[PDB]
Amino acid sequence: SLYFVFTQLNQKTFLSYWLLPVAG
Amino acid sequence: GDRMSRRLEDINKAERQRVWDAMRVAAAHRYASGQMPAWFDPEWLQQEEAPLNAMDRMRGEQRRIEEQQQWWREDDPYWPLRDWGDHPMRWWTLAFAAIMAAGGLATSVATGYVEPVQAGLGAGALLALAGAAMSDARCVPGALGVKLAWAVCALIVLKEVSVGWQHKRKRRLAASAPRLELTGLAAAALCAGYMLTDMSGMGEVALPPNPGAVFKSPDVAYRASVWQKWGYGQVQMRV
Amino acid sequence: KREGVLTMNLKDYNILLNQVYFAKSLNFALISHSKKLKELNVS
Amino acid sequence: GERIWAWRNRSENERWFWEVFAWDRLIFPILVIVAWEYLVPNHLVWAVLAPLALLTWMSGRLPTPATPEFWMLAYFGFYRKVWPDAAAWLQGYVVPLMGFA
Amino acid sequence: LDFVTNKFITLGYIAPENANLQSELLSTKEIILTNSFKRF
Amino acid sequence: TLQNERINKQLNAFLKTYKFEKLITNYKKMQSF
Amino acid sequence: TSLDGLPETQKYVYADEWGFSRVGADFPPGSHPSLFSQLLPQALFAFDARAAVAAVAVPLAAMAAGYGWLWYMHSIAPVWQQALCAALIGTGYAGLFKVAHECAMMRFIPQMPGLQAALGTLLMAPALYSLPSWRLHHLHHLLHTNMLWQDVWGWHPLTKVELADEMVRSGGSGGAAMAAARLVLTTPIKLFASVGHWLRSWDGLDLRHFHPASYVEVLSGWAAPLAFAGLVLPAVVSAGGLSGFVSCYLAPWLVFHFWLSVLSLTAHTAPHIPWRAEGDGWDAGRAAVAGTVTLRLPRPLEVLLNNANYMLPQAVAPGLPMWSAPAAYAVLAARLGPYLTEASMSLKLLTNHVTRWQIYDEEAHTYRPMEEVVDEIEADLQQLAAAAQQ
Amino acid sequence: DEVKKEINEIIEYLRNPALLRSRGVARIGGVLLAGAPGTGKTLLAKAIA
Amino acid sequence: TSAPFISPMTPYVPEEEPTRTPPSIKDTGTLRPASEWYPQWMQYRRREDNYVFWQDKFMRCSTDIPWAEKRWTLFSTVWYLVQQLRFVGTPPALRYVAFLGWRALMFQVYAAHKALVLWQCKLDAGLARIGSGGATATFSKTMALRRLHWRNSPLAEALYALNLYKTGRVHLLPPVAKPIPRPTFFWLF
Amino acid sequence: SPLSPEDIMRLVQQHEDVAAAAESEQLVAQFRDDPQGLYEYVNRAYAEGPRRVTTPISLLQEEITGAVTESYPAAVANDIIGMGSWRLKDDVDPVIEFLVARLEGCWREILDTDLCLYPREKWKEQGWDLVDSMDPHQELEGFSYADIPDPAKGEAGYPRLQLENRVYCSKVFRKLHVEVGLRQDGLQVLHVVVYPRYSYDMPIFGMDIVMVDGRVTLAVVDCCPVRADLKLQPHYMETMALLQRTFLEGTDPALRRIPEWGSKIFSPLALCITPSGPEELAAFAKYAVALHRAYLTMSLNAVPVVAGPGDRREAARLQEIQDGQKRFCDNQLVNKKTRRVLEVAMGVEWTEAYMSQLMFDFDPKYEPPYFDASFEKLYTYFDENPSFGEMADEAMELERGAEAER
Ligand SMILES: CC(C)CCC[C@@H](C)[C@H]1CC[C@H]2[C@@H]3CC=C4C[C@@H](OC(=O)CCC(=O)O)CC[C@]4(C)[C@H]3CC[C@]12C
Ligand SMILES: CC(C)CCC[C@@H](C)[C@H]1CC[C@H]2[C@@H]3CC=C4C[C@@H](OC(=O)CCC(=O)O)CC[C@]4(C)[C@H]3CC[C@]12C
Incomplete structure (x- = not known):
């Protein structure tokens, strides 16, 4: 009965940030 | 006191009215599907006020009025500023729909382009339907009508000032750029006149409330509901 | 069909509270308790 | 001070949106998926299979068709990296078996 | 008095023996009492 | 067929009683108070 | 009942003077137009699929043949070929519109009320009519049939005292109103006066004329017409230009409106039919059966228009289906023969409707020509002025 | 019966906390079982757990 | 009388919850600013009767907010950025200077409006003369005050000008302007 | 083969008389199946028992502390009230008590959506709701029945007479009047009369009991016509006959004599009896009770006789209604037994006024209003069929999906 929304992706780690500068 | 009596009486009147309205709604949903005890007279759903509140108002009114007696129309010039039951911006909506359809047909036959007549007739039809539903401003259609009218005139202003008209293309590139012409100005005057009159209806449609609106709410079941919806059903409610 | 409305006057809940708890509070849990009793009984 | 008090009482939803929702649950996942699919050559092990594993490990739940993550992955990764070629593969290997060539 | 007594008996009331553990009126009873003052 | 004389008799009842129902209401007005 | 009981010889010479096939007998007061429904056999109210599907698909095929013939030679056709295709398509649409008017009174397929209401709405849309x-x-017509000052949704006749009132109110017969009335009730454009009726629907586009518990249904009723004239009417123009619009839409429209107007005008107007105000001698069964006319068609036109001229078999029985309207008439003449009235297609009848029967006078209780009436009420103005010089 | 129905909420909090939130009960963090001296209070916890 | 059960001589017009917070307690209906901490009337009442100042504060700020000012829409979540800039991203000193400038400007605007109102009363007194033709050079203080407090819609003043110029009757005034409700559309604004 | 202007009128007559017969049959169809239940309703209500009220508040109260709330059908209720708060009770015979309780309970239970009390400036302000012969000017504020002792034999004021009235209005009925009078010598009377409104075509109801030292000396009950032909509608006659077969069986038919003032008002089935013993009295009581209840249940479905402009038939019908009601009205005051009872004690100048304004007053231009309180039927309804507010539904689906785990 939730909504159609994302989850957090960074409550566990930080590695995902490594993806933004590289692509930039 | 005399100052707390008023508070109590306004609370009571508001509660009586709310319960009568809930009754009208639930009785309509029970009678439109058969299960009504056959003494039910379906004309009761037309009594708007409430029987109790009405008796109170009638008694008070007769007491007041008994104890106080211990174009142009030269008999009333202010005939327009009188409540007839419909929205004020009602003949403007129909006038603009007629103007739109007439200009659409005229220009799209006198040139040969197929866009102006389609736009003009669509705008005219939607504004005519809106000006029809705006003929009873007390009901719910009287509100969805103003909504539809504002939406259509806003879309007109948008298309004009941001994309311009196909039949107004020229060879240059700075002269064939979209500016604001007459029909856009009229549509903008319409949106402004709608907003300055009454568009306050159907106010319970908005984005749903966050867990940030129920942080200090005094009710636990509501807050748990909101958290559960927004994806936080597991967080502990140390509250 | 389906209707979400409250045909109950809140003064009745207030009266029941004052009676049984001066001789929890007015929230949605109370109204839900009411509905649960009604349903499990009428069956 | 009085103005800040009145303004805080009328804007709780917008406040929680901008402080908790705007980046962490709206903009960052979009950016991360688009960025990953911009890199990461057009295979299936890289465009679909490893994204799912890493998304479930990070977010702590599997992306099902009930979630926006599954649909973002599907569209970008599958439709724009493996489909324009697996389409030719099926058009040259499996459709001849059936009636129409 | 007679009319209101008839109505109240048919609406419901707590029997003397059935009370093991009347400060205010419910809402239907108030509609009935107001109308009864209007009629009689 | 019954589905059709049903409609027939119903419209007939309506058309025959209209005139009396117009007068019974000119009556459900002066009495209540 | 205006030229009631007298020897049948003079009523027959009147019927031959007016083109009428018959003149009614005497009808006594105190009756209900639903009475004579007890005579019809219990099988005349039967339902069957084949007759209905024929009644809907035959004028459809007529219209489709006409369009195909036109689009085959879209605009290179001469004028009278265009007129032939317009007449054919308009007749097919009059038939489809009678099917519509059937499902509007809920007597077409009572088995599926929703499907039949949707069919009526869809088929009324192209003519810009709200179900x-x-x-x-x-x-409201059936209830006030032939009543004075009350049936304005039929062919309400123009009376004498009101025309004198307007004569004084305009200060002569030279104003716009008098000229408009003259030109509309004197030339064959009268045969298209139903167009004005179409403008009297959309009651100002105003929900304040209706019952609140009906609003959401009335608005949807105004939706299907509007949507049509908002979506399809542009497309046609876009793909056909002005002329290509006066051809594939406007002419079949004028044809259908002609058919409608003449059907009604000849069904409920005649010199042997008086128009009484109720209280001053009105009656339901009398003004229903005695003040009516039934018209005759060729069986091709009767299978096309779908029995569009039998209005009495379904005024005695409002629930009588459509493929049974002739058969029921077969029974009615067996019983009320002398009181019925009948007529046929004749340009003489229309010419008398145009030139002779123009103004209704309540003194002689009959219709008179408009120029004689206008000169004579000018003479009565001379009279009242003679009484006014002193 | 008293303690039966006043711990039929402890049991369900142990089973389904989301159901008890729907009853205005935020959380149960600590309970006391009082009685007359000579109660054998450890007897209940067995069947409860 | 659509009402089946009860129909008093005055027809029932439904009441709906308000959509905006009332003027504070301190502001005049006009354009001039207020005394900026304490109203002048507070000095002519008993000390035990001026709890209404702080009570009105508590009401407008925390206790009676009409549920139409807490609607979450796409427009309000950008107005949030604007307001949060103004309240957290600007130093109070610049805010104070802007405040002083705005106060001065509004005072000048009020003076201009008052002059315009006086000129309007002259013109209307002059036109009612042509209207009634005869003796009345008068106006109505009612209309002057209603013009100074913005209580007339433009249609009302137009109808009043016509009525004056045609029949005089300088004491026949348009009914009143009613308060504008808060516009709402959908999740949009 | 065709028809003539005379058989079509025959056809309209056929149809309309058939319709009248149909509705007249529909009226009696309900009584026909079981007539014994027109008197035996109270015993059945007692048999079925107390009913447990189940509203959400009632259930909540019952589950919090212990309290069960009970209700009773209106027949049981009007049997607990009895001759409830009449001021002249305790001196009224037990038969008159039974009859008054039953009649007023019927009025309260059957007409409870429009039963107003008659306008008070007509009877209750002059003080005609309680009348004493020792205090005709009302200087004891209406407590004379308590402050003044009974006069002894030969004293001024013997024999003392006192009356108590009650008058109601309603939708169909323009006056429902009950009155009880006692004299000191031992005479007690009871006089009931129910008048329909001038716009309705129904017969008048009337009942009189007169008893002397606990022995009924005269008992008459009549559902009396209002037409000039003195014949009721088929349902009225059918019901009276069916009821006489049900209750008056085994009773002397030669006792229902027609008094000299009777046949001018009496329906051919009217009853006038001088009972002999307990059996005659019990049978007559059950019969009068069932007849009154039937009369009211029949009025429950009545429709006014409206005279549309253009119809003279209905105007003549309304004129006939007026003539019949007035004929009965001035034909009842010549029942000079009770009138001489009144005039031997209260005088004549007071009796003329009291009688002409209350007893059998007739004023075609005056019928009082009534108060239509049917909307209450809604409120009570929605107290056993409530709907809860869109938030209890989530919780109830939670509870259903939780308990069904097992
Ligand atoms: C100012 C700029 C940055 C745009 C801001 C957009 C947000 C306000 C939007 C974007 C995504 C939206 C969400 C996307 C999907 C849903 C599900 C959808 O659910 C419903 O329809 C619930 C209906 C109800 O139960 O009332 C609407 C709410 C919600 C959470 C939306 C709430 C509003 C959000 C956060
Ligand atoms: C332009 C064509 C090809 C497409 C179809 C257009 C119709 C949907 C329009 C054209 C004529 C319009 C009618 C013209 C005149 C009026 C009167 C007008 O109302 C009034 O004038 C109110 C009464 C009064 O003023 O006395 C608006 C409704 C109505 C029926 C209009 C309804 C909409 C109609 C039928």
């Missing part, structure tokens, strides 16, 4: 306003106006 519920039509149904309300038709019941």
Whole structure:
């Protein structure tokens, strides 16, 4: 009965940030 | 006191009215599907006020009025500023729909382009339907009508000032750029006149409330509901 | 069909509270308790 | 001070949106998926299979068709990296078996 | 008095023996009492 | 067929009683108070 | 009942003077137009699929043949070929519109009320007609049939005292109103006066004329027409230009409106039919059966228009289906023969409707020519002025 | 019966906390079982757990 | 009388919850600013009767907010950025200077409006003369005050000008302007 | 083969008389199946028992502390009230008590959506709701029945007479009047009369009991016509006959004599009896009770006789209604037994006024209003069929999906 929304992706780690500068 | 009596009486009147309205709604949903005890007279759903509140108002009114007696129309010039039951911006909506359809047909036959007549007739039809539903401003259609009218005139202003008209293309590139012409100005005057009159209806449609609106709410079941919806059903409610 | 409305006057809940708890509070849990009793009984 | 008090009482939803929702649950996942699919050559092990594993490990739940993550992955990764070629593969290997060539 | 007594008996009331553990009126009873003052 | 004389008799009842129902209401007005 | 009981010889010479096939007998007061429904056999109210599907698909095929013939030679056709295709398509649409008017009164397929209401709405749309306003106006007609000052959703005749009132109110016969009335009730454009009726629907586009518990239904009723004239009418123009619009839409429209107007005008107007105000001698069964006319068609036109001229078999029985309207008439003449009235297609009848029967006078209780009436009420103005010089 | 129905909420909090939130009960963090001296209070916890 | 059960001589017009917070307690209906901490009337009442100042504060700020000012829409979540800039991203000193400038400007605007109102009363007194033709050079203080407090819609003043110029009757005034409700559309604004 | 202007009128007559017969049959169809239940309703209500009220508040109260709330059908209720708060009770015979309780309970239970009390400036302000012969000017504020002792034999004021009235209005009925009078010598009377409104075509109801030292000396009950032909509608006659077969069986038919003032008002089935013993009295009581209840249940479905402009038939019908009601009205005051009872004690100048304004007053231009309180039927309804507010539904689906785990 939730909504159609994302989850957090960074409550566990930080590695995902490594993806933004590289692509930039 | 005399100052707390008023508070109590306004609370009571508001509660009586709310319960009568809930009754009208639930009785309509029970009678439109058969299960009504056959003494039910379906004309009761037309009594708007409430029987109790009405008796109170009638008694008070007769007491007041008994104890106080211990174009142009030269008999009333202010005939327009009188409540007839419909929205004020009602003949403007129909006038603009007629103007739109007439200009659409005229220009799209006198040139040969197929866009102006389609736009003009669509705008005219939607504004005519809106000006029809705006003929009873007390009901719910009287509100969805103003909504539809504002939406259509806003879309007109948008298309004009941001994309311009196909039949107004020229060879240059700075002269064939979209500016604001007459029909856009009229549509903008319409949106402004709608907003300055009454568009306050159907106010319970908005984005749903966050867990940030129920942080200090005094009710636990509501807050748990909101958290559960927004994806936080597991967080502990140390509250 | 389906209707979400409250045909109950809140003064009745207030009266029941004052009676049984001066001789929890007015929230949605109370109204839900009411509905649960009604349903499990009428069956 | 009085103005800040009145303004805080009328804007709780917008406040929680901008402080908790705007980046962490709206903009960052979009950016991360688009960025990953911009890199990461057009295979299936890289465009679909490893994204799912890493998304479930990070977010702590599997992306099902009930979630926006599954649909973002599907569209970008599958439709724009493996489909324009697996389409030719099926058009040259499996459709001849059936009636129409 | 007679009319209101008839109505109240048919609406419901707590029997003397059935009370093991009347400060205010419910809402239907108030509609009935107001109308009864209007009629009689 | 019954589905059709049903409609027939119903419209007939309506058309025959209209005139009396117009007068019974000119009556459900002066009495209540 | 205006030229009631007297020897049948003079009523027959009147019927031959007016083109009428018959003149009614005497009808006594105190009756209900639903009475004579007890005579019809219990099988005349039967339902069957084949007759209905024929009644809907035959004028459809007529219209489709006409369009195909036109689009085959879209605009290179001469004028009278265009007129032939327009007449054919308009007749097919009059038939489809009678099917519509059937499902509006709920007597077409009572088995599926939703499907039949949707069919009525869809088929009324291309003519710009709202189903519920039509149904309300038709019941309001049935209730006040041939009543003075009360049936304005039929062919309400123009009377004498009101025309004298307007004569004084305009200060002569030279104003716009008098000229408009003259030109509309004197030339064959009268045969298209139903167009004005179409403008009297959309009751100002105003929900304040209706019952609140009906609003959401009335608006949807105004939706299907509007949507049409908002979506399809542009497309046609876009793909056909002005002329290509006066061809594939406007002419079949004028044809259908001609058919409608003449059907009604000849069904309920005649010199042997008086128009009484109720209280001053009105009656339901009398003004229903005695003040009516039934018209004759060639069986091709009768299978096309779908029995569009039998209005009495379904005024004695409002629930009588459509493929049974002739058969029921077969029974009615067996019983009320002397009181019925009948007529046929004749340009003489129309010419007398145009030139002779123009103004209704309540003194002689009959119709008179407009120029004689206008000169004579000018003479009565001379009279009242003679009484006014002193 | 008293303690039966006043711990039929402890049991369900142990089973389904989301159901008890729907009853205005935020959380149960600590309970006391009082009685007359000579109660054998450890007897209940067995069947409860 | 659509009402089946009860129909008093005055028809029932439904009441709906308000959509905006009332003027504070301190502001005049006009354009001039207020005394900026304490109203002048507070000095002519008993000390035990001026709890209404702080009570009105508590009401407008925390206790009676009409549920139409807490609607979450796409427009309000950008107005949030604007307001949060103004309240957290600007130093109070610049805010104070802007405040002083705005106060001065509004005072000048009020003076201009008052002059315009006086000129309007002259013109209307002059036109009612042509209207009634005869003796009345008068106006109505009612209309002057209603013009100074913005209580007339433009249609009302137009109808009043016509009525004056045609029949005089300088004491026949348009009914009143009613308060504008808060516009709402959908999740949009 | 065709028809003539005379058989179509025959056809309209056929149809309309058939319709009248149909509705007249529909009226009696309900009584026909079981007539014994027109008197035996109270015993059945007692048999079925107390009913447990189940509203959400009632259930909540019952589950919090212990309290069960009970209700009773209106027949049981009007049997607990009895001759409830009449001021002249305790001196009224037990038969008159039974009859008054039953009649007023019927009025309260059957007409409870429009039963107003008659306008008070007509009877209750002059003080005609309680009348004493020792205090005709009302200087004891209406407590004379308590402050003044009974006069002894030969004293001024013997024999003392006192009356108590009650008058109601309603939708169909323009006056429902009950009155009880006692004299000191031992005479007690009871006089009931129910008048329909001038716009309705129904017969008048009337009942009189007169008893002397606990022995009924005269008992008459009549559902009396209002037409000039003195014949009721088929349902009225059918019901009276069916009821006489049900209750008056085994009773002397030669006792229902027609008094000299009777046949001018009496329906051919009217009853006038001088009972002999307990059996005659019990049978007559059950019969009068069932007849009154039937009369009211029949009025429950009545429709006014409206005279549309253009119809003279209905105007003549309304004129006939007026003539019949007035004929009965001035034909009842010549029942000079009770009138001489009144005039031997209260005088004549007071009796003329009291009688002409209350007893059998007739004023075609005056019928009082009534108060239509049917909307209450809604409120009570929605107290056993409530709907809860869109938030209890989530919780109830939670509870259903939780308990069904097992
Ligand atoms: C100012 C700029 C940055 C745009 C801001 C957009 C947000 C306000 C939007 C974007 C995504 C939206 C969400 C996307 C999907 C849903 C599900 C959808 O659910 C419903 O329809 C619930 C209906 C109800 O139960 O009332 C609407 C709410 C919600 C959470 C939306 C709430 C509003 C959000 C956060
Ligand atoms: C332009 C064509 C090809 C497409 C179809 C257009 C119709 C949907 C329009 C054209 C004529 C319009 C009618 C013209 C005149 C009026 C009167 C007008 O109302 C009034 O004038 C109110 C009464 C009054 O002023 O006395 C608006 C409704 C109505 C029926 C209009 C309804 C909409 C109609 C039928």
